[PDB]
Design a protein around this nucleic acid. Structure first.
Ligand code: K
Ligand code: K
Ligand code: K
Ligand code: MG
Ligand code: MG
Length: 136
RNA sequence: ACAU
DNA sequence: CGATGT
């Protein structure tokens, strides 16, 4: 329908999938970068999309903001609503960091409330989400 | 089949 | 072409 311009948009970027993962959140209206995570050596697209939403929830909660969050990831939206990231990535020594972050994000969801609406960015109708990394 |  | 996910 209509873009809600008063919102936060988040997205993952990577070098390979699985591969090096990063994510960021931007003001949908202005494009200003509000947060960007230092690259994580190995993760998946969906783990990064999930972390990006949870980071957005935490960022907005700390600022008393009721803005919605846009994500282009059906998977990550579902994982956040379930409070469970059902990733297939092997959990071993190489993937320890991403799994630690995912575990901690789940723990945050299980210990806090939020009213932030989590909305699907409608890429087919509106083009690329404003937090996209432009690598495709 | 659809979302990344 | 490879990959992650519902
Ligand atoms: K996309
Ligand atoms: K991109
Ligand atoms: K598939
Ligand atoms: Mg995305
Ligand atoms: Mg993108």
């Amino acid at each position: 329908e209509e873009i809600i311009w008063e919102s936060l948009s988040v997205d993952v970027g990577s070098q390979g999938n699985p591969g090096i993962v990063e994510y960021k959140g931007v003001d949908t209206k202005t494009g200003e970068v509000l947060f960007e995570r230092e690259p994580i050596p190995i993760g998946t697209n969906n783990m990064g999309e999930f972390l990006a939403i949870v980071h957005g929830l935490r960022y907005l909660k700390e600022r008393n903001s009721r803005k919605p969050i846009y994500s282009d990831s059906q998977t990550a939206i579902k994982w956040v609503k379930d409070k469970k990231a059902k990733s297939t990535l092997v959990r071993n020594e190489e993937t320890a960091l991403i799994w630690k972050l995912v575990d901690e994000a789940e723990e945050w969801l299980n210990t806090h409330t939020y009213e932030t609406p989590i909305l699907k960015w409608q890429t087919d109708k509106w083009g690329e989400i404003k937090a996209d990394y432009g690598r495709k």
